[PDB]
Amino acid sequence: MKLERVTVKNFRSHSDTVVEFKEGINLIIGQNGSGKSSLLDAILVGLYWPLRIKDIKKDRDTYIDLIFEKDGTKYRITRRFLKGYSSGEIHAMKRLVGNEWKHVTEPSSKAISAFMEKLIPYNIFLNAIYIRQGQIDAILESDEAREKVVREVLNLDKIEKVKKYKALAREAALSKIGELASEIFAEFTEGKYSEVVVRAEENKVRLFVVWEGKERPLTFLSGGERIALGLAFELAMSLYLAGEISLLILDEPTPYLDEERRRKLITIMERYLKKIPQVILVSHDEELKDAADHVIRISLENGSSKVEVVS
């Protein structure tokens, strides 16, 4: 999957917003209330309507047009929500054939929904592509938090034989995650650590890194290495779910004003995240510009969201 362009009209603070996404790392900066979160929401709506997101339906017309790429085919979803009661809706999903857009299914919400559910399943997008806020932190918070995260992201599972079976399934899953995360984390730490261990004990998912043939908790790592581990873990889950990493959306994976980790993040961005076909990074940090391939600033001007390409 690869986002090309999103157009949003009359959705919250977006009166007339057009955002072009390019290859590599797309950095989105701006303040809280500028319109970036609502832009992500607009994208979600564009892709997976009907779903529960306020300020879309009627209760000026709301217009969302999304152009994206999937397995060598340009898709365009156009949605228009009419407000007035008269309160109709107009939906279309088209494919680019030469230079003409041609419908791929009935111009209906249900048909387009059914179609999208097959093209790119909603769970795949939410769990593998879209990394929402607090996730990477939750991975690093504690074993219980980690357990919650992995349970939610990978489905998993919360008469003793059945318990043993469940434990076995969980074990297999977490072991695979361990392998994937080991590889990615090895890629990240420049070869310093080559093995990551993920294990379940009761209501807790232990996470360790192997150093000199001994499992050690994340405590014995630097902040950068911890963030690297969290990212590697998330990416491992993404690979586990999707079988590949094409698009990755990172909505504020970092904290507020903590440069001690920003460096490692910049390193990771420059040296590893640029390998990914496309990355959307939504941050408040102005210091990431140089590490991105494309920078987009979203601000609030005259009460409306303004988009400007930085440099």
Binding residues for ATP are 12, 32-38, 133, 192-193, 220-225
The answer to whether 179 and 204 are in contact (CB under 8 A) is no
What is the phi/psi pair of residue 56, to 5°?
A: -100, -70
User: How many whole angstroms from its chain centre is CA 200?
Assistant: 25
**Which amino acids are annotated as binding site, given as ranges?**
12, 32-38, 133, 192-193, 220-225
Distance CA 253, CA 230 (A): 10
- Rg, C-alpha atoms of the chain: 21
The answer to whether 72 and 89 are in contact (CB under 8 A) is no
User: Token pair of 10, please?
Assistant: 């009359």
The CA-atom distances, in angstroms, between 118 and each of 112, 122, 124, 125, 278 are 10, 9, 11, 12, 22
Residue 191 CB-density burial (10 A; 0-12 exposed, 13-18 middle, 19+ buried): exposed
| Torsional class of 24: left (φ above 0), alpha (ψ -120 to 50), beta (otherwise) | left
Distance CA 288, CA 291 (A): 5
Using the structure block, give the residue that is written with the tokens 């603070």.
13
CB atoms within 10 A of CB 5: 13
